[PDB]
């Protein structure tokens, strides 16, 4: 009933990803506030048990919070953004058969895994560390869910190959380049989890075998486990580099800087996982040091980015009548939530980064490992930057997909949602980083032992405050998203509008630089040798000495 | 303007980059320092030491909690601890000050954490593997061990104790 | 136009935050050492 669906059927496919994505975010995020209070030393759970009778414990909540938000929402967002954007930029159509196959895989795979989670048969958390054994349908569900991305990789490789064929010797366009090294990086990354799942988790929960080696299980897990946060980040980065400078009234100030950033992510994203295993036995301390260094290097892409985006925002700001050293901050369009959401997120990303760089320094980890600090670190990262970017992007992407415009009432509701979400996330971060310096362990129902951590007196106040602020924010967001998704207001012409892609200042020195980076086949091979060099030596030694242990259910 | 801005930016960009590496290399140095000191003791043993988690508490070093501690050097004491579903053995662990305590920790069931409040002892404890860490307490007393890795429904409640005698 | 003074301001704020956090925690490591 939409022609706009008929020359851009890729629009509809993209909408379904986003819709499924934001739904997961809502269901997941409900447990957020309850968990913030938990860390405020307030026990809200009998209340939530009454609303949601199916919730059996704090830990099922957390499993649902982790999985729907960090695995489901983020992967669905990525798939929408890192397929659609490279499609609109090349002005080509994604192989539509495959695209819809990946949506159903993701949809069926979610539903298959939703059941055991909702039936409390897989209260194992989103890391699912063996021997804690979850229902087989959870493992199969996720497998297929994650395998959906393999169809996306293909679709976007296709799109790229087809643009290559039609333009022999031209330099891959930026967004496409980003999407291309994006999905290749993810492919290299995804082998870890896929191997864990095919070698251990699936046979195990099918009963074919009785034991699983915890050390290899989690070593392979963190193979995929780190690049997957970059698999979360980069779709937001793609948007910030190539859509935000325009929403800010300026230009992306450097094409090849943006290319270099994404290139380095393909390069250093995967061979660093041991930074999650600093506290593990049976992994040589040298290999840890190596990986600690490769992890500081992986920080460089985000340091570069920090300047590039700032330059563009200041450029945007000056064009807007940016006064002196800070005048350009006031010159930006603080009235547009599509701009506000990501920039605020970038602020929260500053404490976010320092925490991560701390965490990465091998020996410094022991201070914070598994404490409330780590949740501190990553809510500034995924639940702030990524989420806020995504929410903000509702303001332009959603019009372009559906042809529904945005009212002033809604555009203002968004600004409220966005500022609250930001303020709520900041407040919490201080609570959790604080609490984490005081040894409060993460993944704990601490309200159920009210006297255990009295020294976290004041941070607990913050954690409480954040829970209230963020619950409001969440409710307002549900309100505003549904108000946009439930109006019948349709202008099919704003649906046929171009995406607000931003133009790029180009220089002379670009060419030779950019050319060298478009050597994708070579850089991918280098990417892969690194993984083999980083993981190989250890993986072989762990595989030489397999010590499978029986599974357990303790919920 | 604009094309001017391009050169300025890309200049200041190389600068920032070089300064950032330089600052990372400074962190690389300082971490290397702690690796060389006494404090690198909390870094888990590199070596694979496989044990069976279904027999850990019928036969072996972790069987009898009354054999847990065992003096192994002039100032060295090996403490065989067992992190199990919702508690630690021995409770308490009773150790001397200014002695180099070598912890050798394992689990008969699921993954737990061994976090000694006040210290840098923060190691994951894995069924079928021994987690070996060294630490010389200097400050005497009542250290409480916290499980910081989700282990089950009573995880939030899995505490242990160290008693380093003056 | 000229030197990106505000970009500098942003990366400066970032650099200080990295130091306060890193040195900050490097402190606690030894204090617990
Ligand atoms: C997508 C989400 C995530 C991002 C991004 C992220 C970044 C890093 N992380 Fe991390 N992380 C670790 C290391 C790093 C490092 C080195 C970085 C780096 O990539 C960070 C680099 C970031 C920067 C260097 C900041 C750049 C700032 C920018 C770009 C903004 C500038 C602002 C502007 C320009 C705006 C100005 C605006 C105006 C208006 C003026 C380590 C250890 O090395 C652990 C283990 C902890 C433990 O012990 O368990 C860890 C733990 C986690 C966990 C928990 C996993 C679990 O449950 O076990 C998650 C979910 C996570 C996610 C994320 N993490 N991380
Ligand atoms: C409603 C707003 C939110 C609040 C108030 C909130 C709060 C919290 C808190 C306090 C924890 C610590 C719980 C524990 O360790 O037991 C937590 C865990 C977590 N949250 Fe959030 N969060 C929110 C939204 C999000 C979003 C948007 C994401 C991802 C996009 C996310 C991802 C995670 C993850 C991955 C964990 C760790 C789960 C685990 O340790 O297995 N959260 N959240
Ligand atoms: Cu043992 Cu949590
Ligand atoms: Cu990581
Ligand atoms: Xe899933
Ligand atoms: Xe999986
Ligand atoms: Xe993860």
State the smallest CA–CA distance between residue B2 and chain C in angstroms: 6
Give the binding-site residues of ligand 2, using a 6 Å CB cut-off: A 29, 32-33, 35-36, 39, 62, 65-66, 69-70, 73-74, 125-126, 375, 379, 382-383, 387, 442-443, 467, 470, 474
Among B20, B127, B156, whose Cβ lies nearest the Cβ of A214?
B127
Are B17 and B53 in a shared domain?
no
Distance CA A133, CA A121 (A): 9
Distance of CA B84 to the CA centre of its chain: 17
* Strand-pair partners of B106: B82
Distance CA B23, CA C14 (A): 13
Work out whether the CA dihedral A295, A362, B62, A452 comes out positive or negative. Answer: negative
* Strand-pair partners of B146: B115, B159
- Asked if C4's CB is within 8 angstroms of B8's CB, the reply is yes
Which segments of chain B are extended strands (E)? 69-71, 76-84, 87-89, 93-96, 100-106, 112-116, 122-125, 131-136, 141-146, 159-165
Ligand 1 midpoint to CA A44 (Å) = 30
Q: What does chain C come to in residues?
A: 33
List Cα–Cα distances, C30 to A455, B33, B37, B38, C33, in angstroms. Answer: 21, 12, 11, 10, 4
Answer whether A307's CB lies under 8 Å from B149's CB. no
Chains that touch B (3 or more CB pairs under 8 A): A, C
Look-up of token digits 């605020």: A344
Structure-block tokens of residue B67: 């054999």
- Asked if A354's CB is within 8 angstroms of C18's CB, the reply is yes
Mapping DSSP onto H, E and C, the string for A461-486 reads HHHHHHHHHHHHHHHHHHHHHHHHHH
- Asked if B109's CB is within 8 angstroms of A552's CB, the reply is yes
Answer whether B120's CB lies under 8 Å from A366's CB. yes
Q: Which of A383, A433, A448, A470 for a ligand 2 pocket mutation test, highest count of atoms within 8 Å of Cβ?
A: A383
The C-alpha R_g of chain B, in whole angstroms, comes to 22
Q: Is A324 exposed, middle or buried (0-12, 13-18, 19+ CB in 10 A)?
A: exposed
- Relative to beta strand B141-146, strand B112-116 is antiparallel
Q: What does chain B come to in residues?
A: 166
Are B55 and B17 in a shared domain?
no
Interchain CB contact of A345 with C (< 8 Å): no
Distance CA B26, CA B48 (A): 32
Are B91 and B166 in a shared domain?
yes
Work out whether the CA dihedral A453, A456, A461, A466 comes out positive or negative. Answer: negative
Distance CA A155, CA A79 (A): 10
Mapping DSSP onto H, E and C, the string for A308-373 reads HHHHHHHHHHHHCCCCCCCHHHHHCCCCCHHHHHHHHHHHHHHHHHHHHHHHCCHHHHHHHCCECH
Distance CA B99, CA B102 (A): 9
Answer whether A209's CB lies under 8 Å from A550's CB. no
Answer whether B120's CB lies under 8 Å from B42's CB. yes
DSSP structure string for A469-530? HHHHHHHHHHHHHHHHHH-----TTTSSSPP-PPPB---STHHHHHHHHT-HHHHHHHHHHH
Cis peptide before A213 (omega within 30 of 0): no
Q: What does chain A come to in residues?
A: 555
What are phi and psi for residue B88, nearest 5 degrees?
-125, 150
Look-up of token digits 């995924």: A382
Distance CA A190, CA A220 (A): 10
Q: Is B65 exposed, middle or buried (0-12, 13-18, 19+ CB in 10 A)?
A: middle
Work out whether the CA dihedral A316, A407, A79, A124 comes out positive or negative. Answer: positive
Distance CA A10, CA A4 (A): 9
Interchain CB contact of A206 with B (< 8 Å): no
DSSP structure string for A408-454? HHHHHHHHHHHHHHHHHHHHHHHHHHHHHHTTPBSS--GGGSTTS-G
- Relative to beta strand B100-106, strand B93-96 is unpaired
Given the residues A77, A145, A230, A241, the one annotated as active site: A230
Distance CA A139, CA C25 (A): 38
Q: Is A341 exposed, middle or buried (0-12, 13-18, 19+ CB in 10 A)?
A: buried
List Cα–Cα distances, A52 to A30, A61, A114, in angstroms. Answer: 11, 10, 15
| Closest ligand, as measured to the CA of A63 | 2
Distance CA A165, CA A267 (A): 26
Q: Is residue A50 within a helix (H) or strand (E), and if so which, with residue range?
A: helix A45-51
Distance CA B94, CA B70 (A): 11
Distance of CA A433 to the CA centre of its chain: 21
Among C3, C15, C32, whose Cβ lies nearest the Cβ of B12?
C3
SS3 assignment, position B115 = strand
- Quote the Cα angle for A214-A218-A220, to 5°: 120
Cis peptide before B92 (omega within 30 of 0): yes
Q: HSE of A112 in the Cβ direction (CA atoms, 13 Å)?
A: 17
Distance CA B131, CA B110 (A): 14
Ligand 5 midpoint to CA A196 (Å) = 16
Answer whether A166's CB lies under 8 Å from A96's CB. no
Which segments of A155-230 are extended strands (E)? 211-212
- Asked if A281's CB is within 8 angstroms of B45's CB, the reply is yes
Distance of CA A214 to the CA centre of its chain: 26
Structure-block tokens of residue B12: 């200041």
Distance CA A81, CA B93 (A): 54
Are B99 and B165 in a shared domain?
yes
Helix crossing, A74-90 with A96-118: angle to 10°? 170
Residue among B166, B162, B100 nearest B139 (CA): B166
What are phi and psi for residue A76, nearest 5 degrees?
-70, -40
Distance CA A376, CA A436 (A): 8
What determination technique applies here? X-ray
Residue among A38, A50, A18, A3 nearest A464 (CA): A38
Residue of A nearest to C14 (CA): A350
* Strand-pair partners of B79: B69, B103
Given the residues A58, A377, A453, A535, the one annotated as active site: A377
**CATH number of the domain that B7 lies in?**
1.20.1070.10
Classify domain A1-555 by CATH number: 1.20.210.10
Q: Is B106 exposed, middle or buried (0-12, 13-18, 19+ CB in 10 A)?
A: buried
Are B20 and B62 in a shared domain?
no
Residue numbers of B between 103 and 142 with CB closer than 8 Å to C: 118-120
SS3 assignment, position B150 = coil
With b for 16 or more beta-carbon neighbours within 10 A and e for fewer, the A123-133 pattern comes to bbbbbbbbbbb
Q: HSE of A200 in the Cβ direction (CA atoms, 13 Å)?
A: 30
* Cβ contacts of A298 within 8 Å, gap of 6 or more: A264, A265, A268, A269, A272
- Determine whether A226 is an active site residue: yes
Where do the domains of chain A lie?
Answer: 1-555
The C-alpha R_g of chain A, in whole angstroms, comes to 23
Answer whether A460's CB lies under 8 Å from A393's CB. no
Interchain CB contact of C18 with A (< 8 Å): yes
* Cβ contacts of A84 within 8 Å, gap of 6 or more: A10, A11, A14, A94
What are phi and psi for residue B66, nearest 5 degrees?
-80, -5
Q: HSE of A226 in the Cβ direction (CA atoms, 13 Å)?
A: 26
Answer whether B105's CB lies under 8 Å from B124's CB. no
Question: What strands lie across the sheet with B93-96, from one edge to the other?
Answer: B93-96, B159-165, B141-146, B112-116, B122-125
Residue among A43, A71, A514, A534 nearest A263 (CA): A514
SS3 assignment, position A62 = helix
Structure-block tokens of residue A50: 């009454």
Distance CA A550, CA A39 (A): 33
List Cα–Cα distances, A177 to A130, A353, A478, B13, B111, in angstroms. Answer: 38, 25, 34, 21, 41
Distance CA A145, CA A305 (A): 31
Distance CA A459, CA A463 (A): 6
Q: Which domain holds residue B13?
A: 1-44
Give the count of domains, chain B: 2
Structure-block tokens of residue A9: 């059927």
Answer whether C22's CB lies under 8 Å from A357's CB. yes
Answer whether B125's CB lies under 8 Å from B83's CB. yes
Interchain CB contact of A437 with B (< 8 Å): no
Q: Is B36 exposed, middle or buried (0-12, 13-18, 19+ CB in 10 A)?
A: exposed
- Quote the Cα angle for A274-A301-A161, to 5°: 100
Residue among B99, B93, B39, B104 nearest B75 (CA): B99
SS3 assignment, position A94 = coil
Interchain CB contact of C11 with B (< 8 Å): yes
Residue of C nearest to A309 (CA): C7
Distance CA A190, CA A226 (A): 10
- Determine whether A274 is an active site residue: no
What are phi and psi for residue B52, nearest 5 degrees?
-90, 125
Look-up of token digits 């809510």: A379
**CATH number of the domain that B135 lies in?**
2.60.40.420
What are phi and psi for residue C6, nearest 5 degrees?
-70, -35
Chains that touch C (3 or more CB pairs under 8 A): A, B
- Asked if A361's CB is within 8 angstroms of C7's CB, the reply is no
- Asked if B46's CB is within 8 angstroms of A282's CB, the reply is yes
């Amino acid at each position: 009933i939409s022609r706009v669906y008929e020359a851009y059927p890729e629009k509809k496919a993209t909408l379904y990803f986003l819709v499924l994505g934001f739904l997961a975010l809502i269901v997941g995020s409900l447990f957020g506030p309850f968990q913030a209070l938990n860390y405020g030393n307030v026990d809200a759970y009998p209340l939530l048990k009454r609303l949601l009778p199916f919730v059996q414990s704090y830990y099922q909540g957390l499993t649902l919070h982790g999985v729907l938000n960090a695995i489901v929402f983020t992967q669905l967002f990525a798939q929408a953004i890192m397929v659609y954007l490279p499609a609109r930029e090349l002005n080509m159509r994604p192989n539509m058969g495959l695209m819809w196959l990946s949506w159903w895989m993701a949809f069926i795979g979610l539903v298959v895994a939703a059941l055991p989670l909702l039936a409390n048969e897989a209260t194992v958390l989103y890391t699912f560390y063996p021997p804690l054994k979850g229902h087989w349908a959870f493992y199969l569900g996720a497998s297929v869910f994650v395998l959906s991305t393999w169809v996306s990789i293909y679709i976007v490789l296709d799109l790229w190959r087809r643009w290559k064929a039609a333009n022999p010797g031209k330099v891959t366009p930026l967004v496409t380049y980003m999407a291309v090294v994006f999905w290749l990086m993810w492919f290299l990354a995804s082998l870890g989890l896929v191997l864990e799942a095919v070698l251990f988790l699936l046979p195990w929960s099918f009963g074919l075998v009785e034991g699983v080696d915890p050390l290899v299980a989690r070593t392979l897990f963190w193979w995929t486990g780190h690049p997957i946060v970059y698999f979360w980040l980069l779709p937001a980065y793609a948007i910030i580099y190539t859509i935000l400078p325009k929403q800010a009234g300026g230009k992306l100030v450097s094409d090849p800087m943006a290319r270099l950033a994404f290139l380095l992510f393909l390069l250093l994203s995967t061979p660093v996982g041991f930074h999650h295993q600093f506290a593990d036995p049976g992994i040589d301390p040298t290999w840890k040091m190596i990986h600690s260094v490769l992890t500081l290097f992986v920080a460089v892409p985000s340091l570069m980015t920090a300047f590039t985006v700032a330059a563009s925002l200041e450029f945007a700001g000056r064009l807007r009548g940016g006064r002196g050293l800070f005048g350009w901050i006031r010159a930006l369009p603080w009235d547009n939530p599509a701009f506000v959401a990501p920039v605020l997120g970038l602020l929260g990303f500053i404490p976010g980064g320092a925490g991560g760089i701390v965490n990465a320094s091998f020996t410094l980890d022991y201070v914070v490992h598994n404490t409330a600090w780590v949740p501190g670190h990553f809510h500034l990262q995924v639940a702030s930057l990524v989420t806020l970017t995504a929410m903000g992007s509702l303001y332009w992407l959603l019009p372009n997909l559906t042809g529904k415009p945005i009212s002033d009432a809604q555009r203002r509701l968004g600004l409220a949602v966005v500022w609250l979400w930001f303020l709520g996330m900041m407040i919490m971060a201080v609570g959790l980083h604080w609490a984490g310096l005081l040894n409060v362990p993460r993944r704990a129902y601490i309200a159920q032992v009210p006297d255990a951590y009295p020294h976290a007196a004041v941070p607990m106040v913050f954690n409480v405050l954040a829970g209230i602020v963020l619950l409001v924010a969440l409710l307002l967001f549900i309100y505003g998203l549904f108000s946009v998704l439930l109006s019948r207001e349709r202008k099919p012409e704003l649906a046929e509008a171009p995406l607000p892609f931003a133009e790029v200042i180009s220089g002379p020195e670009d060419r030779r630089l950019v050319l060298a980076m478009d050597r994708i086949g070579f850089w991918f091979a280098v990417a892969a040798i690194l993984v083999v060099l980083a993981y190989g030596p250890t993986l072989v030694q762990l595989f030489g000495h397999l010590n499978p242990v029986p599974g357990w259910r303790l919920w | 303007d604009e094309h001017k801005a391009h050169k300025a930016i890309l200049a200041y960009e190389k600068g920032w980059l070089a300064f950032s590496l330089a600052m990372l290399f400074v962190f690389i140095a300082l971490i290397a320092y702690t690796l060389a000191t006494h404090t690198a003791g909390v870094i888990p043993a590199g070596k694979l030491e496989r044990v069976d988690p279904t027999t850990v508490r019928q036969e072996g070093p972790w069987a009898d909690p009354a054999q847990a501690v065992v003096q192994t050097g002039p100032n060295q004491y090996t403490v065989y601890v067992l992190a199990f579903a919702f508690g630690y053995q021995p409770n308490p662990i009773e150790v001397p000050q200014g002695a180099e305590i070598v912890f050798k920790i394992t689990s008969p069931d699921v993954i737990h954490g061994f976090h000694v409040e006040g210290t840098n002892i923060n190691v994951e404890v894995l069924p079928g593997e021994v987690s070996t860490v060294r630490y010389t307490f200097k400050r005497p007393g009542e250290y409480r061990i916290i499980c910081n890795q989700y282990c089950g429904l009573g995880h939030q409640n899995m505490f242990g104790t160290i008693v380093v005698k003056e | 136009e000229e030197k990106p003074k505000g970009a500098l301001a942003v990366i400066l704020v970032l650099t200080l935050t990295i130091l306060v956090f890193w040195l900050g925690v490097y402190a606690v490591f030894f204090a617990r050492g």
